[model samples]
Target: SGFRKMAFPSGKVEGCMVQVTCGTTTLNGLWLDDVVYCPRHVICTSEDMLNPNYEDLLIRKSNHNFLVQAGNVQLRVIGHSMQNCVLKLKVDTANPKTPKYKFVRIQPGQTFSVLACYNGSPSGVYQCAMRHNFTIKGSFLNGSCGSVGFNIDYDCVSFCYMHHMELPTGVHAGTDLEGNFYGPFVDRQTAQAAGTDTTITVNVLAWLYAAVINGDRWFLNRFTTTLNDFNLVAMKYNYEPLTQDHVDILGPLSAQTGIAVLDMCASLKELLQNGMNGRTILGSALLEDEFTPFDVVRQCS
Candidate 1:
């Protein structure tokens, strides 16, 4: 309830002991005073007094009113030199006969939280060691990115679908290959053009294809099923060129482009499959060998 202090001589108090009587009641909180002694003075305490070392000392409550329990407990120390003490506390709920609690050491500015979970145990007592110089560091953010960094959260749907369903099935809105909301794509034609070989062009094209497929899948899932969920759309459309309307309006566009659209799709499918297998088709091979444009001829009938 109130502050209590105890002192010991440098030599004689090595094993010295004292019991405090809380006026027919036990005190919940207790404090002790440092034993005052001058340097260069030899300890002259007797063996009995010095035998009971202050180190590994134990504190116990005579009455069961202060029964030790396990769980969350808070301890606060207020003193001018509290930072110089090493305080170590442990609880032993297994057997009270063995004195489950022990005080290790005390240090300055030492504080932390602990999760104390022991079966069927009441609060445990604490032990503290005094007179030691310990370093105390202030709390500050470390690292180049600073305290907080970016984070993204997502949820996906899974199920079965029928084959004849015109609406895109087996694909969820806004889910990318890397399981991210959207994949990134950038036009780097100028950069590619500067290179003599086709390496840059091929790399850029592959990236573009991935971006388009992800975008298309995201578009189909959003408007048709997820309904105009802007957040979902934004997650998939964040850095891509293709818009939601691109896939949604594919039907009408295909009608307008007719045979040309069909030819393009066929070529794209072939290119993608071949590219997946690390195959490359030169531009001249497509133009001069495989596909040739034919002039429209009127039917005489």
Candidate 2:
């Protein structure tokens, strides 16, 4: 119910008086029942302040968590989240339909207790899911948002993958079973502002990445063979062996993604330093997988 009256661009208008983007509130122990119409708050605010669509709405597993009481329903963990659940119902006092349910997401650091009193019977999570699915692009394959692995991981688990990717020349296209072309988010015309996209094959890392995702222990083990093995990868970008820190980061990502990480240090060494023919990146060192296509790092264009 807290709102600041905001005037339109003209600074004066009768009907224009409404709560504008109230601002960002950091919730520590704030009750979520009050967040019931959280989405409505967006409606009253400035689009510039937020994503036009609050796709990742309401809950993120940070140290922020809270409790909520919806009409004495005593909903706990109202601010908890990977998904925000909203229920549509009839607020109809005399045949009135009003959507009146919101769950909170509690975080790891928050001092919260669970007390889901109502059996969570708010129309239904599935019902809200269907609405959001049909309501916008968020609930489908065309849905968008989130960082690389965090966002893309779900798609991979569900068997969805990037069929067509970008290249330096312009773009690559892939078709569904029906022969419809879809890919390279940016086409040549759209790439005009960016510039010509180019492709550089750096897939040894990609194949290793695939091995990490697929849990292919053996091939992934074939990643690094020598002390200079990892050093070579760093050398490509102009650096030295002060690079073991990166391999350490991969260790955590390994556990988080259910992928086991290994010490490819000495393993990546030999073939690369040996200077082999028809089996190297610059025709000097060695390559990881001949079958795996070199990872095409798409430049912005």
Candidate 3:
């Protein structure tokens, strides 16, 4: 303990450092690799040699560290600049495609995108398990010897609340434009904030089938007028054991939504047709830009 060189895991990347003040002597140096060594001006008696130039302290006026709850979490900065600071973000839940930690570089009126899980209350059968969007907005600052502050904004995007599957299905199994897998928990407002589109458009018939299969009526009713006043209590139709409850719920909705059964075996074909049609309707809207019912069958099947 008399004189030992300690090795610590500094959570900063290369080329980053801090200043230290010890009595009359000040040790300000760049972070070379890991350890912070004393600068030439601090310990060395080289009066003719100059100290290495270092950037001033970069910070946000409001707070340096931020921890926010997901669901439409929006943080704004009224006055300050942040261009000089290096921004980093790590989510509570990790997504394999986007790493948990990374430095983000953003300018004023700019934003960075990452994947974050939705915040939902899981009680009994209900739960939360999907990553949507997280974004960071930055500002500008000059490198000067002063406590300069700046503006910063950030938010998390919510897709949807998925229920009743052993290993989350539907939107949880979708992909983005880059072929990176992402859940389809779509919310128009949040998508816009994240600079992305509402990829999956809701089709009336498709949603009706989804409502029956997923047993989710409250949210579906809230968004669409067609199902709002229907007053039909829906339950999960697709179950592992496939009980009478599943049959009763599926039968009525299938009939109402135009799924017919000529005979037991023939009805299987009709089920495929209806399922294929509804999904195709959804798929057509999803693929309108670069991308159908058959294609929907291939992907959704």
Whose TM-score is greatest here?
2
**Taking the tens digit of each residue's C-alpha lDDT, what string does model 1 give over 1-301?**
1111111112211111111112232111111222110100011123413243323222321222222222233222221111111111222222212211222222221221111111222122121111012111112111100010010111211101000001122111111111121112111111111111111111222222232332322111111222233224323422122234433434333343332222333344334334334333321122111110100000000
Q: CA lDDT, every prediction?
A: 0.19, 0.24, 0.23
Instruction: Give one digit per residue, the lDDT tens place, for model 2 in 180-280.
Output: 22232321222312222211112244334444344434422334243454555546533224234445544544454444333443334333454343442
lDDT by residue for model 3 over 1-301, one digit each (tens)?
Answer: 0111111122221112233222233322222222222211222123322331222222311222222222233222122222211122222332222212222222111111211111211111111212223211111111111111111122211111111111121122222211122333221112222323221111123233433343322222222222211112111211112223333434444554344211221322233233444343222322121111111122222
User: Total clashing residue pairs per candidate?
Assistant: 20, 25, 6
**Candidate ordering by TM-score (highest first):** 2, 3, 1
The TM-score of predicted model 2 comes to 0.22
Model 2, residue 30: distance off in Å is 35
Which of candidates 1 and 3 is the stronger one according to lDDT?
3
- What global local distance difference test value does model 1 have? 0.19
User: Candidate 3, clashing residue pairs?
Assistant: 80-150, 80-151, 81-150, 159-185, 160-185, 171-184
Worst 10 contiguous positions by lDDT, candidate 2: 124-133
Model 3, position 18, has a per-residue lDDT of 32
